[PDB]
Amino acid sequence: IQRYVRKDGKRYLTDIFTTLVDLKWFFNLLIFVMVYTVTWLFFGMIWWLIAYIRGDMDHIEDPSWTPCVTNLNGFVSAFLFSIETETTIGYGYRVITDKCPEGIILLLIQSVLGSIVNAFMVGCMFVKISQPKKRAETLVFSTHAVISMRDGKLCLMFRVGDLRNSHIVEASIRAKLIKSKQTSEGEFIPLNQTDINVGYYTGDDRLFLVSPLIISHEINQQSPFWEISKAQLPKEELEIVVILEGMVEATGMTCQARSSYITSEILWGYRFTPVLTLEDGFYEVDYNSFHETYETSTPSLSAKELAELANRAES
Amino acid sequence: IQRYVRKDGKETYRYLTDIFTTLVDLKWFFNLLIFVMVYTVTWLFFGMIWWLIAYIRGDMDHIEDPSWTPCVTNLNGFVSAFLFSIETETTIGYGYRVITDKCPEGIILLLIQSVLGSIVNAFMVGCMFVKISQPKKRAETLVFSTHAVISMRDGKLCLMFRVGDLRNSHIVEASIRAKLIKSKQTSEGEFIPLNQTDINVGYYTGDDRLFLVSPLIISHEINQQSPFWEISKAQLPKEELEIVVILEGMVEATGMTCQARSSYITSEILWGYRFTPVLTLEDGFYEVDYNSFHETYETSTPSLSAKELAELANRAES
Amino acid sequence: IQRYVRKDGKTYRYLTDIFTTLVDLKWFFNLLIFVMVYTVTWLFFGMIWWLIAYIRGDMDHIEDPSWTPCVTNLNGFVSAFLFSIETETTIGYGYRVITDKCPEGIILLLIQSVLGSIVNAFMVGCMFVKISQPKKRAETLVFSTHAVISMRDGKLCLMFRVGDLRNSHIVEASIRAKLIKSKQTSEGEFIPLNQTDINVGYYTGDDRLFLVSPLIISHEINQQSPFWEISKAQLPKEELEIVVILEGMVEATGMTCQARSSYITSEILWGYRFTPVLTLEDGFYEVDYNSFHETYETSTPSLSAKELAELANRAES
Amino acid sequence: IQRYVRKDGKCNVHHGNVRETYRYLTDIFTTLVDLKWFFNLLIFVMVYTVTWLFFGMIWWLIAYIRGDMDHIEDPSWTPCVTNLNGFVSAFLFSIETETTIGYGYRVITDKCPEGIILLLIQSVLGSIVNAFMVGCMFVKISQPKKRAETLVFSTHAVISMRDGKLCLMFRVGDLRNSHIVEASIRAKLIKSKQTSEGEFIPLNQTDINVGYYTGDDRLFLVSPLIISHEINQQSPFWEISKAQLPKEELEIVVILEGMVEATGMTCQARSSYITSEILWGYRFTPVLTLEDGFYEVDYNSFHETYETSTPSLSAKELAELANRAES
C-alpha cells in the first residue's frame, strides 16, 4: 500500500473521434459557408461589372475583339470564374488575357484575399481544436461543509475529490466568502469578499488528490468565521465559494471546478465519515459514503469565545 | 439570489455579431494592404526573372513562328511574364500559359518559385495564426472607475478604486495588482525619476484573487508599508504621483486569459469620497445599475495623513 | 570556469533524424487513415457527379455534338471520380471542365471547394496534434534513490538530490514536497491519510531552482515541520510516505516538463550524507554521475529535532 | 505627460512602427536565424525534391512498361498521361500535380487505373507533407518562453547606500522601448560554502530578495529601470566587506520573464555577474532625462558610467556601528 511510482502514480480510434469532437461542430461550418459564398458572389459580380464596362459582352462572339476573360459571356460564367480563380483551381476554359490591366489588378487582389481567407479558416480551426482549458471533469465537491473540533482548535472543512479514476492528482484550491458588511464609518457594502485561507501562506494549497480529502480551514483571529457561533450561523446570510484547479496525469490539460455552500449546507458539530478504511495488505474506498456526514459533540461557542475561555482558564 | 449555488455559475447571436465587428477596424485593412504589397513584390520579381529568361532565350521574334519552343508558350514578354508569375506562384495555372520540356532553366525556375511561394504562404499562415491566437486577449469588457477615492474605513484610512465587467457574467475569475510610479530622492543625494512600488491590494493574504460576480470595490489600506503613508489632503494635489493598475483573468465562456489596464494621476484621485453602490438588494433578486458605476459621492473624512491620524490616535490612547 | 554567461548558460541533423524515425513509425500506420478519409470523400463525390450527369442525361447524348454536358468529357464512373479528385484537391487540369449551363453543377462546386478547405484545415490540425506529442513526463530529472537526514549548522535537515543528466534538458525548475501519513487527532477524528507540505523554501522563494548541476535540496526541520517530533528510533516505527514534484518551466527550449518520485520510511536514511557529485580542480571541474545516489554515514545526534532543540535551550540557560 | 494606458499602450506615437516591429519579431521568432534558417530551409527544399523526383521516377516507369514510347507517335494510342516524354515530362508532371498547379497541357487519361491510383497516393502524400510542415511551423511559433532579443541587463552590478541602508542594484530594461512590459525578475547567487559540521557544498544556491515577499518583483518597465536588493540580516551579502568582495569569488545570475505586448506571448532573458563585475561604492548614472512635455532616454548611458562615495564597512558591521551610535 504505497501511493507512488518512481515516475508515475499507483483506443486510438476513440482518441481520434474525441479529437474530431472539437467544439467547431455545425454553426462554424455554416459561418465558413456563408463567408466563402459572399466573397465569391462579390468577386463574380465585380468580374461581370468589369466585363460589361469593357463592352466585352457586346462583342461576345466577335473574333476580332480580345476579351478580358476568355469565354466569359454571362453572370453565371462570371461567378464560375470567380469561384475557380479565388479557390485556386483555374480549369482554363475561362482564362484572363494580357489585354486588361484592370483584370490583372483584380486577379492580384482576389488571390491575396483568397489566401487571407484560407489562412483565417486554418487559424479558426486551429483555435477551435486547441482548447486552452476544460471544465469539471467530475471533480465533485461535498454537498455539505462542516464545522468541527480538531486538536484543540475549531476548524471548517469540506470534502473534495474525484469519483472517476485517479487521472488528476495535482490541484490548487481557493475559497472565497461572500457577505454583506456594515462599516463602522456608515458605509454599506452589499457584496464584501474575503479569502478564507486554506493554507496559502504555508503553500499547503498545492494539494495532492491521491484520495478524497477533507480540506480544513482554521478559525483564527483572522478568519472571517472568527465571530460566528452556533445560534448565529443560521441567522447569518453567509455564503462560501470554493474553486479547484488542477492538471491531468497522462496528458497535458488543466481542469477547473467550483461550488458554493450558502448557509443551509454548513452544518455545525458535524464530522465527515472516512471514505478510506485500511486493512492488512489492502484498502477500500466507500465512495457511496462520500457525502455522508455524522454528528459529534462540539462546543456551541464561537471561536472567539473559545479563545476567551481558554485565556480565562490559563489566567 | 444565491450566487453560484448552481455549480454552473448563473446570446450566441450577440457573440457572432461581436466577432463580425471584431475585424471592422482599419488596422486589419492596413495589414491586408501590406501583405498585398509583399505578395505583389514577390510576384513582380519572379515575373521580371521570367521575362529575363525569355529574353535570354530570345524567342520574341520566333513567336510568329511555330518553328520554336519559347520555354513558356504564348508569352508576350513584359505583361505575360508577370501574368504567368501570378498564375504559377499562387497555384492556379490556367493552362493558356504553360512551360515546355525543352528549356530546363524554366523547370528549375518553376521549382524554386514553387518552393518560395510555399514558404511565403507558410509565413502568412503563421502570422495570421499569431494574430488570432494571441495568448493575452485585451478584452474590452473590463472597466475601471475613472476616479479612485480615499476614504475612512473601520478606523483605517484606505484607497479604493472600483473594478468590474460590463457583460456582468463574462469574466468571474481575475487577479489584480497595482503599482505606483513616482519620483523619489534619498538622503544620500540619489535622484531616481521613475521609482516603482507595489501597493499591497492583498498579495500577502492571497486576497488579490477576485470573484467578479458583480462590479466590485478594491480596497488598499494605507499603513506603514503603503507609499501613501505620508500623503496628506493638501499635499496630494502637489505630489504629482501616478498609479497603474493591471487586471488579468480567464474568460468564463472559454479558459482563455484576458487582461485589462488603467492608470490614475493625482488629479483623478479624490479625497474624502466614497463610491455610490452599483448593486442594491431587492426581494428575490438584486438590481445592478451600471450607470452609477463611475459615480462617486462625498463624505466627511479626516484631512490629516494616515501617519498623523495614527499619531493622534496614539496620543489619545496615552 | 564560468559556464553561466549572458544567454546560453554554458548537431541539429541528428535530432532531426531521430525525430524522423519516430515520426516514421507513426505515419507508417497513420497516413493509412488519412488516405482512407480522402479517398472516401473523393469516391462519394465522384459518385454524386456521375449521378448528376445521369439525371441530366448527358451520357445518353454522349457523343452528340449539339449537347452541352454539365461536365465536359464525363463518360463513366471512373471519369466522374477523376473529375472529383481533380476539383476537390484543387488541381483541375481542365481536360474535363464544368460548363455554365447547369446550376446544380455550380452548387456542387461551391460545396466541393468549401468542404475541401474544411477537410484540409482539419488535416493540418490533426497533423499539428500528432507532431505536438504533449507528453508532460521528462526522461531526465532523476531523483536520488534515497532521501537522507543529516546535521547542518546546528540544525537537522532532510535532503534529497535532484538534477538532470545531459545538463541541457533542464535549467530551471520548481520543487514541491508533500508528506502524507495517517494521523490520530486528539479529538478522536482519525484520518486515514493526512497530507502536509514540507517547506523546501516556498516562504522565501528558494523553492525555485537553477539546475546547472545535481543539487541537494534541504528542508530544515524547524518547530513547524512534520519531522519536528520524530527521532532516529521513531523513524523505523512511523510508517510514512513522501512525494516530491518537480516541474521544469522550460526544457532549455520553451516547453514545460514535469517529474515525480517518492520516499518511504525504509528509504529515508538517518545520520547519512550525500557524496559530492562535483569536485573542483584548477582550471576545470569533474562530475561523476556514477556517485549520484551514493551515500556515506556521518556522526549525528540520535535525539529528535524537538529533543535536540530542547537540550540546546536548556544548555543556553 | 503621463503613461495613462487608459485602454491601450503607452502615451507614444507610432503607426507603421507597430506593423514593422510585429513583422520583424514574428520573422525572427519563426526563423531562429543562425542554425534553424538555412537548416530547415534545406530540410524543406529537400523533402520536396525527393518526393517530386521519386514520383517522377515512378511516373516514368509506369509510362515505360506499356504507357508510352512504344506508341508515342501513334494517333490511335491513348497514353496514360497525354504528352509525356519519359524523363523530363514525367518530372514536370510530378511537379505540376503534387503542387496542385496542373497546367493541363499534360493530363491524366481516365482509362488507366494504375495512373489513377498513383495520382491518388501522390496527392494524399503531398497534402500530408504540406500539413506536416505547417504543423511544425505552428508548434515552433507557439511554444512559450521564447528567448528575448531586445531585453538587456546592465553589464555591471553595483553596490551603494540608500536611505541609510546598503543595497545591491543592477539596471534592467528593453532597448526597443515599450516592447516588453510587466516583466518579473528573480535573482540567485551561486557560491560554495562549508558548514560548521564539515560538510562542503561545491555549488550552493541562495535566492536574493528582490521583492518576492511584497510582490514587488513584478515590475512595469515604463523605461530603463533600476532593480535593487536590500542587504539585510537575511541577505547573503550581509557578511562581505569592500575588501572581501574581490576575494570571495561569488557569482550571481539574473532571470527575467515578461510578456511581449505586441502579441501577448511570453519571452525570457538571463544574465550573470561575477566578483570582477560587482563594483563597490558606485551608482548608476540616470538614464531618463525629464523635460517640459517630454522625456528623453539616451540609451548609450544605459549600460555603464558610475560615480559615488560609500563606506568601506561591511553591511553587518555598518549596522552595528549605527546601533552603537544610536545607543
Side-chain angles (χ1 to χ4, degrees), chain A residues 1-4 6 9 25-57 59 63-101 103-127 129-130 132 136 138-163 166-184 186-236 238-252 254-278 281-291 293-307 310 313, chain B residues 1-9 26-60 62 66-104 106-239 241-255 257-281 284-310 312-313 316, chain C residues 1-2 4-6 8-9 29-59 61 65-103 105-126 128-132 134 137-138 140-165 167-188 190-222 225-248 250-254 256-280 283-289 291-306 308-309 311-312 315, chain D residues 1-6 8-12 15-17 20-22 25-33 35-67 69 71 75-113 115-148 150-162 164-248 250-264 266-290 293-303 305-307 311-319 321-323 325:
Chain A
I1 311 174
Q2 325 300 352
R3 297 155 284 272
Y4 76 94
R6 305 316 304 213
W25 307 303
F26 299 103
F27 43 71
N28 51 290
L29 308 181
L30 254 297
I31 295 294
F32 318 153
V33 170
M34 51 204 97
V35 70
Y36 264 117
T37 307
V38 308
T39 304
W40 294 330
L41 282 162
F42 174 55
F43 274 101
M45 167 47 198
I46 278 164
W47 279 111
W48 155 278
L49 183 143
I50 185 169
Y52 196 6
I53 293 290
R54 271 287 305 272
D56 207 354
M57 320 206 185
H59 289 76
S64 57
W65 168 268
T66 302
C68 168
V69 189
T70 49
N71 291 357
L72 190 160
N73 52 17
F75 193 101
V76 59
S77 77
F79 175 65
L80 263 166
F81 187 67
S82 170
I83 172 60
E84 287 166 352
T85 292
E86 200 273 2
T87 201
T88 70
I89 290 178
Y91 290 105
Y93 182 74
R94 292 161 279 279
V95 51
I96 88 179
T97 69
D98 43 29
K99 312 306 297 182
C100 189
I104 305 296
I105 305 304
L106 261 173
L107 167 62
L108 188 168
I109 188 138
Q110 188 168 17
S111 305
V112 175
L113 190 140
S115 186
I116 289 277
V117 169
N118 183 32
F120 188 17
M121 186 67 34
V122 169
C124 285
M125 212 66 40
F126 203 90
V127 167
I129 64 166
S130 61
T138 62
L139 288 154
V140 317
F141 292 78
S142 169
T143 58
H144 292 70
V146 309
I147 291 164
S148 73
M149 262 315 297
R150 282 188 162 191
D151 48 356
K153 186 55 54 60
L154 192 148
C155 325
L156 172 140
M157 58 217 63
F158 55 84
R159 207 198 292 280
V160 170
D162 183 0
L163 291 179
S166 52
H167 69 290
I168 173 171
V169 293
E170 297 200 37
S172 302
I173 182 164
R174 327 195 279 90
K176 278 290 196 300
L177 174 140
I178 295 181
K179 196 186 193 292
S180 315
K181 185 177 71 154
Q182 283 275 14
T183 63
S184 73
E187 186 193 353
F188 166 89
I189 168 164
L191 167 144
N192 178 37
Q193 309 189 13
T194 59
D195 194 301
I196 48 161
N197 79 309
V198 286
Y200 186 55
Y201 304 106
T202 78
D204 179 320
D205 303 355
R206 312 171 298 186
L207 83 183
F208 189 63
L209 287 316
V210 76
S211 207
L213 292 105
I214 299 167
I215 310 301
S216 59
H217 162 67
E218 188 174 344
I219 309 311
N220 57 36
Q221 65 78 46
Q222 184 274 350
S223 165
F225 306 102
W226 170 251
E227 301 211 303
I228 305 304
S229 71
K230 172 60 150 292
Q232 203 154 350
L233 187 42
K235 297 298 77 174
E236 292 296 335
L238 265 161
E239 180 173 315
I240 300 171
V241 167
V242 180
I243 291 114
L244 178 148
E245 61 183 322
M247 80 88 77
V248 291
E249 301 311 313
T251 179
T254 53
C255 174
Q256 186 171 119
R258 315 202 270 287
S259 184
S260 74
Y261 291 70
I262 328 177
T263 189
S264 62
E265 313 193 0
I266 298 191
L267 316 170
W268 179 281
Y270 275 63
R271 187 177 284 165
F272 275 112
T273 196
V275 69
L276 269 163
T277 42
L278 307 175
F282 58 95
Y283 68 100
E284 58 273 318
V285 280
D286 198 322
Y287 268 20
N288 73 68
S289 306
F290 182 97
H291 305 302
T293 312
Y294 78 100
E295 179 176 33
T296 174
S297 184
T298 56
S300 61
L301 295 308
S302 67
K304 193 178 185 188
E305 284 158 307
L306 256 290
Chain B
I1 317 181
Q2 281 71 25
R3 287 159 293 263
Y4 219 92
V5 171
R6 283 139 298 161
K7 327 307 165 177
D8 307 294
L26 303 176
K27 283 183 168 69
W28 279 253
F29 309 148
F30 192 21
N31 279 253
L32 164 155
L33 257 294
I34 75 102
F35 228 64
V36 162
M37 208 27 49
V38 72
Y39 270 112
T40 189
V41 65
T42 306
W43 293 324
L44 190 44
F45 164 51
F46 273 85
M48 61 165 48
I49 87 182
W50 273 110
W51 159 232
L52 175 168
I53 177 166
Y55 179 73
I56 288 289
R57 293 289 83 197
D59 77 324
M60 299 322 259
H62 303 64
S67 60
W68 198 254
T69 307
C71 181
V72 54
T73 191
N74 257 28
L75 188 87
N76 165 287
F78 305 100
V79 59
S80 309
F82 178 81
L83 191 39
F84 184 64
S85 149
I86 189 72
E87 287 170 351
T88 291
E89 198 264 26
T90 205
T91 76
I92 288 172
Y94 293 101
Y96 181 74
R97 291 157 280 273
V98 59
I99 75 176
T100 313
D101 53 17
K102 301 305 192 306
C103 294
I107 274 150
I108 81 168
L109 204 40
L110 163 62
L111 204 160
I112 170 54
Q113 186 166 20
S114 307
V115 163
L116 189 140
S118 186
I119 270 176
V120 171
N121 173 269
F123 174 73
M124 204 30 171
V125 166
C127 175
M128 183 66 75
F129 162 54
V130 170
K131 193 82 80 177
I132 186 60
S133 191
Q134 55 187 350
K136 278 293 195 70
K137 178 180 179 179
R138 255 279 309 101
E140 304 86 354
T141 197
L142 277 156
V143 291
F144 295 84
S145 161
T146 57
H147 289 64
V149 284
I150 290 167
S151 175
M152 202 46 207
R153 272 186 152 201
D154 298 338
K156 298 290 192 177
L157 192 301
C158 311
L159 174 138
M160 313 136 87
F161 64 84
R162 171 174 282 158
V163 73
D165 51 4
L166 291 203
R167 213 179 295 281
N168 85 56
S169 54
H170 180 257
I171 177 151
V172 293
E173 272 157 1
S175 66
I176 182 167
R177 51 197 166 92
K179 292 205 79 81
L180 180 138
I181 292 172
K182 197 195 177 188
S183 59
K184 195 175 80 190
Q185 182 176 354
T186 86
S187 306
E188 295 75 9
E190 262 216 293
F191 180 96
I192 166 163
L194 194 154
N195 158 79
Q196 308 201 6
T197 303
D198 189 303
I199 53 189
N200 56 301
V201 288
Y203 189 62
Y204 298 97
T205 65
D207 193 8
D208 67 39
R209 305 163 300 181
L210 308 174
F211 203 56
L212 293 173
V213 294
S214 166
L216 171 66
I217 295 172
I218 308 295
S219 62
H220 150 66
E221 287 205 357
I222 295 180
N223 58 14
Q224 273 303 70
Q225 290 67 350
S226 168
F228 297 95
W229 180 245
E230 303 292 6
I231 304 294
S232 179
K233 183 177 182 180
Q235 215 137 45
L236 177 54
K238 298 175 181 181
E239 275 281 351
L241 70 100
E242 163 168 29
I243 298 175
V244 69
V245 182
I246 303 155
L247 180 147
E248 57 199 308
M250 55 80 72
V251 171
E252 183 73 340
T254 180
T257 44
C258 87
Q259 174 159 350
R261 194 184 300 123
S262 187
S263 77
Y264 299 80
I265 171 154
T266 186
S267 60
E268 290 189 5
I269 296 185
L270 312 163
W271 190 272
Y273 274 48
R274 282 178 183 160
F275 274 105
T276 201
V278 63
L279 189 152
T280 40
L281 303 176
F285 72 105
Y286 66 68
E287 61 279 326
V288 60
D289 178 339
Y290 273 89
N291 298 336
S292 295
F293 181 81
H294 299 296
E295 181 166 316
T296 53
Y297 76 101
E298 181 171 308
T299 187
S300 178
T301 64
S303 57
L304 303 174
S305 68
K307 185 181 185 186
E308 287 156 306
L309 183 59
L312 71 83
Chain C
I1 192 158
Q2 170 188 187
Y4 325 106
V5 77
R6 318 308 174 156
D8 54 357
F29 52 78
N30 287 335
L31 161 153
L32 282 313
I33 180 66
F34 270 130
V35 169
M36 194 283 265
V37 58
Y38 257 117
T39 191
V40 75
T41 308
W42 291 337
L43 307 144
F44 164 55
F45 274 119
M47 211 185 318
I48 84 170
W49 278 107
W50 178 77
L51 291 193
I52 181 169
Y54 182 82
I55 306 144
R56 198 173 187 287
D58 288 347
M59 291 95 88
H61 300 77
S66 58
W67 199 240
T68 61
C70 169
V71 184
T72 54
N73 302 331
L74 279 191
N75 303 311
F77 327 107
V78 68
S79 70
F81 166 69
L82 188 49
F83 179 60
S84 176
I85 78 184
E86 287 165 16
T87 296
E88 200 278 352
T89 199
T90 74
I91 284 163
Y93 296 110
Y95 175 73
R96 50 197 68 85
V97 55
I98 176 162
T99 64
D100 54 313
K101 303 181 75 71
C102 183
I106 285 78
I107 290 161
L108 262 181
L109 212 176
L110 302 193
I111 295 160
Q112 203 53 203
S113 306
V114 68
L115 179 52
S117 303
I118 287 159
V119 73
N120 184 55
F122 154 100
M123 173 76 107
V124 157
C126 189
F128 145 73
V129 168
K130 295 305 185 186
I131 183 56
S132 296
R137 186 68 70 260
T140 58
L141 285 161
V142 306
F143 288 80
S144 164
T145 207
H146 284 81
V148 189
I149 284 170
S150 65
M151 261 305 318
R152 306 216 289 190
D153 44 287
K155 291 156 168 287
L156 273 171
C157 328
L158 172 136
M159 23 175 86
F160 54 84
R161 202 192 305 275
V162 60
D164 61 357
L165 268 60
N167 331 300
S168 45
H169 299 309
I170 211 67
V171 185
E172 294 171 42
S174 167
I175 180 163
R176 332 186 288 99
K178 295 209 78 86
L179 166 143
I180 74 194
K181 70 191 292 288
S182 62
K183 176 178 176 175
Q184 173 71 356
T185 316
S186 193
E187 322 311 334
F190 174 90
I191 308 179
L193 69 94
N194 173 345
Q195 310 195 1
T196 307
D197 194 308
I198 55 184
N199 164 36
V200 288
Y202 188 66
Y203 295 107
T204 299
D206 303 65
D207 88 2
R208 308 172 298 195
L209 302 168
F210 197 61
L211 289 164
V212 294
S213 74
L215 274 176
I216 70 180
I217 295 167
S218 68
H219 154 269
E220 190 177 315
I221 300 180
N222 57 26
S225 298
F227 308 113
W228 168 251
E229 302 215 305
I230 75 172
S231 77
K232 191 177 185 181
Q234 295 288 358
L235 178 59
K237 299 296 299 299
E238 312 216 320
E239 193 287 324
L240 71 97
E241 167 166 359
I242 296 172
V243 181
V244 176
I245 299 97
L246 179 157
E247 65 192 67
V250 294
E251 79 309 2
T253 323
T256 306
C257 63
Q258 180 170 331
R260 181 156 69 230
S261 195
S262 91
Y263 300 96
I264 307 163
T265 178
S266 67
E267 202 160 314
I268 294 170
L269 309 179
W270 183 276
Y272 273 48
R273 212 187 297 284
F274 269 117
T275 303
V277 71
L278 278 162
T279 37
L280 303 175
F284 78 109
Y285 63 86
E286 70 203 330
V287 64
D288 171 22
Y289 275 80
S291 296
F292 194 108
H293 311 294
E294 295 300 319
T295 311
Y296 72 94
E297 180 172 314
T298 171
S299 179
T300 178
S302 59
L303 308 175
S304 162
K306 187 178 182 188
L308 184 147
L311 164 57
Chain D
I1 186 163
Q2 299 293 0
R3 313 99 188 162
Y4 276 119
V5 285
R6 191 63 61 156
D8 214 346
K10 330 308 187 299
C11 188
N12 73 315
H15 170 62
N17 321 72
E20 198 276 338
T21 52
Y22 185 99
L25 83 90
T26 46
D27 175 18
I28 63 172
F29 275 5
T30 304
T31 314
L32 319 96
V33 181
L35 180 72
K36 287 200 181 298
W37 190 73
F38 150 89
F39 189 26
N40 309 329
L41 176 151
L42 207 283
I43 204 186
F44 187 79
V45 169
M46 212 48 57
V47 56
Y48 270 29
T49 288
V50 47
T51 175
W52 289 332
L53 258 160
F54 166 46
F55 275 102
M57 201 168 327
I58 87 163
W59 275 114
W60 145 248
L61 81 77
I62 190 166
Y64 175 63
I65 65 181
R66 60 178 67 171
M69 282 60 70
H71 296 73
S76 59
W77 195 249
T78 38
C80 174
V81 186
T82 189
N83 296 331
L84 184 89
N85 302 311
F87 317 146
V88 55
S89 315
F91 180 68
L92 263 170
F93 187 51
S94 284
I95 176 62
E96 286 163 34
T97 287
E98 196 280 325
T99 320
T100 76
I101 292 163
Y103 293 105
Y105 175 90
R106 51 197 68 87
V107 57
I108 166 178
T109 278
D110 59 343
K111 56 185 72 174
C112 198
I116 284 80
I117 170 59
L118 206 168
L119 194 171
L120 207 165
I121 165 175
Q122 185 177 12
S123 191
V124 174
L125 171 153
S127 187
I128 270 177
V129 74
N130 181 277
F132 155 72
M133 185 230 72
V134 170
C136 285
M137 196 293 308
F138 275 155
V139 297
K140 277 185 167 62
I141 186 58
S142 184
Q143 54 86 8
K145 267 75 175 186
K146 326 197 89 72
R147 293 285 337 288
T150 184
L151 202 41
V152 85
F153 306 86
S154 157
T155 58
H156 294 64
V158 75
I159 287 166
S160 84
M161 201 57 30
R162 276 184 155 195
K165 309 301 297 186
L166 179 43
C167 261
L168 172 137
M169 40 211 293
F170 58 88
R171 177 176 287 155
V172 53
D174 48 351
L175 296 178
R176 181 184 294 110
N177 184 276
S178 178
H179 187 196
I180 196 186
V181 284
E182 314 187 13
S184 61
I185 193 166
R186 47 191 169 94
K188 284 178 158 281
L189 71 88
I190 302 184
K191 185 193 181 186
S192 54
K193 83 187 189 192
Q194 187 160 27
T195 66
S196 58
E197 311 313 299
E199 172 172 308
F200 170 93
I201 325 300
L203 186 123
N204 161 80
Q205 306 189 15
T206 307
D207 186 316
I208 51 178
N209 167 29
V210 286
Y212 183 47
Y213 306 102
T214 71
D216 193 355
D217 75 9
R218 310 165 299 183
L219 50 148
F220 201 92
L221 290 177
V222 170
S223 283
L225 170 66
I226 296 177
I227 285 286
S228 70
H229 154 75
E230 193 176 328
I231 300 186
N232 57 26
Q233 198 33 31
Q234 190 269 15
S235 168
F237 304 106
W238 183 242
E239 295 294 344
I240 78 186
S241 76
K242 179 176 164 72
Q244 258 208 63
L245 201 152
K247 291 178 177 180
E248 284 286 291
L250 72 95
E251 195 264 32
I252 295 171
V253 307
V254 172
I255 308 172
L256 184 153
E257 297 174 60
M259 86 169 223
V260 183
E261 188 153 54
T263 71
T266 57
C267 70
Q268 176 163 45
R270 77 179 83 264
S271 188
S272 91
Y273 298 89
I274 307 97
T275 59
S276 57
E277 299 203 336
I278 295 180
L279 308 172
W280 182 275
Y282 276 167
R283 297 190 299 207
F284 280 76
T285 42
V287 61
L288 193 143
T289 55
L290 295 174
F294 73 110
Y295 61 74
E296 298 192 318
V297 280
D298 52 299
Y299 266 84
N300 64 292
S301 300
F302 172 88
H303 283 287
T305 317
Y306 303 88
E307 77 301 328
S312 307
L313 278 204
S314 165
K316 179 191 288 179
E317 96 203 338
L318 182 62
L321 183 145
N323 178 59

